[PDB]
Design a protein around this motif. Structure first.
Motif, short mmCIF file in Angstrom:
data_model
loop_
_atom_site.label_atom_id
_atom_site.label_comp_id
_atom_site.label_asym_id
_atom_site.label_seq_id
_atom_site.Cartn_x
_atom_site.Cartn_y
_atom_site.Cartn_z
N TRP B 117 45.11 10.74 44.40
CA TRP B 117 46.29 9.83 44.55
C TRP B 117 46.31 9.08 45.90
O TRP B 117 46.51 7.88 45.94
N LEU B 120 43.82 6.46 45.88
CA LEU B 120 44.30 5.35 45.05
C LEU B 120 45.33 4.45 45.76
O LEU B 120 45.22 3.22 45.71
N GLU B 121 46.32 5.04 46.42
CA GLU B 121 47.25 4.22 47.25
C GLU B 121 46.54 3.40 48.35
O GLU B 121 46.84 2.20 48.55
N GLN B 253 47.33 5.76 37.70
CA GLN B 253 48.40 6.48 38.38
C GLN B 253 49.50 6.95 37.43
O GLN B 253 50.31 7.77 37.82
N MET B 258 47.70 12.65 36.44
CA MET B 258 48.11 12.21 37.77
C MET B 258 49.55 12.54 38.18
O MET B 258 49.95 12.27 39.31
#
Ligand SMILES: CN(C)CCCn1cc(C2=C(c3c[nH]c4ccccc34)C(=O)NC2=O)c2ccccc21
Lengths: 7, 274
Positions: B117, B120-121, B253, B258
């Motif tokens: 995560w 990914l951000e 996401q 997730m």
């Protein structure tokens, strides 16, 4: 056999 | 002034990204990293808002260094007659995600979920700033062990983000997608998502899935550790052979694997302090 990998 | 503002320490490492040294900013003991690169060795160039010829890397770091984020920020840079010097954030204490995984083996899903995560951000942040990293891999992710925070590094293979095709690439072959291997052509997001698929497998299995071109283009994902059905599905989705079959950042996401991500401090208390 784990390893780094250059660009 | 350069070697007045920053006291320089031990070499942290060197390779395709130049030579990077440990450093402390003298006006406030801020830990930093000092990265040198010879002009002779720079393959890619840009132009700053001032309008000046700079390595593309400086251009990209400047676009993503605004605000806080999951990226290692550019604090400053100097030009020298034969080189450029970049001053960068350095967490302390830190370990890169490649060594962390080598020492700990395959990560628990809850921990892999928290890391992935955050990556990914960080990548979303880049894309929002018009930057495409092009070398996402465990070795380009640092963990701040105290804060439980991941930061992206090494924008030396990066480009400006665009919606047309890319025909140049020179990040890490084993994280590069099958359309690069077969046609020396790819689109940014879809290629990024492939790399992220490789990264997730790396996190949950202990190593990347593919070493050889033939394996990359075959897209058969043998799982070498116990991994939940939901996670396997996400990974196989990221690693669809046809780029247009890959998920968007939003679909990733929002995938069921997730959900209920830990916070970064929780990730530290549970998985990093002990
Ligand atoms: C060790 N490898 C194989 C890749 C590290 C790449 N890398 C780390 C860093 C950075 C840091 C490093 C943190 N650990 C490192 C080990 C070798 C080289 C750099 C670092 C850091 O604290 N801040 C950074 O920006 C970096 C900066 C510019 C270009 C490449 C960089």
């Amino acid at each position: 056999k784990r390893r780094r990998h250059p660009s | 002034p350069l070697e007045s503002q920053y006291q320089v320490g031990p070499l942290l490492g060197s390779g395709g990204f130049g030579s990077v040294y440990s450093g402390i900013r003298v006006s406030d003991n801020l830990p930093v990293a000092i990265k040198h690169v010879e002009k002779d060795r720079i393959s890619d160039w840009g132009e700053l808002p001032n309008g000046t010829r700079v390595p593309m890397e400086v251009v990209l770091l400047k676009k993503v260094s605004s605000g806080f984020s999951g990226v290692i920020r550019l604090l400053d840079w100097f030009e020298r007659p034969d080189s450029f010097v970049l001053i960068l954030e350095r967490p302390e204490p830190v370990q890169d995600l490649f060594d962390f995984i080598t020492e700990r083996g395959a990560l628990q899903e809850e921990l892999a979920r928290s890391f992935f995560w955050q990556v990914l951000e960080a990548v979303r942040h880049c894309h929002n700033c018009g930057v495409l990293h092009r070398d996402i891999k465990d070795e380009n992710i640092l963990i701040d062990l105290n804060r439980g925070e991941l930061k992206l590094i090494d924008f030396g293979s990066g480009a400006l983000l665009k919606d047309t095709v890319y025909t140049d690439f020179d990040g890490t072959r084993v994280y590069s997608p099958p359309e690069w291997i077969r046609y020396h052509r790819y689109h940014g997001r879809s290629a990024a998502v492939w790399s992220l698929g490789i990264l997730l497998y790396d996190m949950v299995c202990g190593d990347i899935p593919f070493e050889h071109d033939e394996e990359i283009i075959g897209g058969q994902v043998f799982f070498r550790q116990r991994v939940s059905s939901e996670c396997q599905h996400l990974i196989r989705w990221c690693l669809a052979l046809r780029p247009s079959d890959r998920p968007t950042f939003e679909e990733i996401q929002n995938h069921p694997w997730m959900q209920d991500v830990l916070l970064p401090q929780e990730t530290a208390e549970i998985h990093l302090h002990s």
